[PDB]
Amino acid sequence: DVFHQVVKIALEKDGWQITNDPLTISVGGVNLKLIAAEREGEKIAVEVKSFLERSSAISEFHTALGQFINYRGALRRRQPERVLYLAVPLTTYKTFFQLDFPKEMIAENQVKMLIYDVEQEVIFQWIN
Amino acid sequence: DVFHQVVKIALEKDGWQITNDPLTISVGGVNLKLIAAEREGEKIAVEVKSFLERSSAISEFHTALGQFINYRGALRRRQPERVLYLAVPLTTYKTFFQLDFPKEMIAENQVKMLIYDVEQEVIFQWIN
Ligand SMILES: [Cl-]
Ligand SMILES: [Cl-]
């Protein structure tokens, strides 16, 4: 809940309007915490991860990646101009996501990223 | 543990040799339950799911899919001729995997599947 609220505030500081939280989505016989936001007509969806959810970073990464792929597929078929981002803390970005394997998997799967700083609750970088 | 043993027995009945359980794999700075098996020089790896692991089937599917993608990527770089399969029970195959959304995601991500019957502990179908 805390990291969810950190990401909303970071988005708000950059002038995004939060329109749905959660963004709910059902497609192809399945009902799938996503934040929907927009800013001057640019629409996005944000999958928030703290990377304290599990065990290891790698275990969380598996679930985060699968969710990312599935939500991205679902969103194509419902709101094709809403771009999906995986939000992760700066500490995780600078450590886990600098390892060769996760960096490669992010690239192979075209994962777009919102890097947020937890302490100050700000957006540090948009990736891809 | 039970479903893990069901899949091994199903493989053994079809003349597969189990060579590693777990198959361990480390690549690109990360250490990633996978069964390694072979039969007349054909090598495979099997990610076993019962689809009783979580909450809903969809929640498990997210983790199963992310794991599949990451293990498949790791295996390319270590044992490129060992083909990865996602093992799922026949009951799940005939219900969840006949829904349009999971069927589509399996197709989009080229997920190969081992469909096993739990009651009789046999392989029913190989997919993709
Ligand atoms: Cl941070
Ligand atoms: Cl079954």
Side-chain angles (χ1 to χ4, degrees), chain A residues 29-32 34-42 44-49:
Chain A
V30 175
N31 166 224
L32 289 103
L34 282 179
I35 297 177
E38 62 182 72
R39 186 179 66 169
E40 296 101 26
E42 183 177 359
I44 65 177
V46 184
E47 169 187 349
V48 180
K49 298 293 185 175

Side-chain angles (χ1 to χ4, degrees), chain B residues 89-91 116-118:
Chain B
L90 184 54
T91 53
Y116 63 100
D117 182 273
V118 174

Side-chain angles (χ1 to χ4, degrees), chain A residues 62, chain B residues 4 7 11 18-25 32 34-37 44-49 64 67-68 70-72 74-75 79 82-87:
Chain A
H62 296 314
Chain B
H4 188 95
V7 178
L11 282 165
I18 318 296
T19 59
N20 312 87
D21 177 15
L23 176 56
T24 55
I25 184 163
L32 289 103
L34 282 179
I35 297 177
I44 65 177
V46 184
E47 169 187 349
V48 180
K49 298 293 185 175
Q67 284 174 340
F68 182 88
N70 283 331
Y71 297 151
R72 179 178 59 194
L75 285 163
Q79 291 185 53
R82 187 176 296 278
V83 179
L84 182 71
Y85 294 85
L86 176 56

Side-chain angles (χ1 to χ4, degrees), chain A residues 28 62-63 69-70 101 104-105, chain B residues 28 62-63 66 69-70 101 105:
Chain A
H62 296 314
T63 297
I69 288 166
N70 283 331
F101 180 75
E104 179 59 17
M105 297 292 107
Chain B
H62 296 314
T63 297
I69 288 166
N70 283 331
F101 180 75
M105 297 292 107

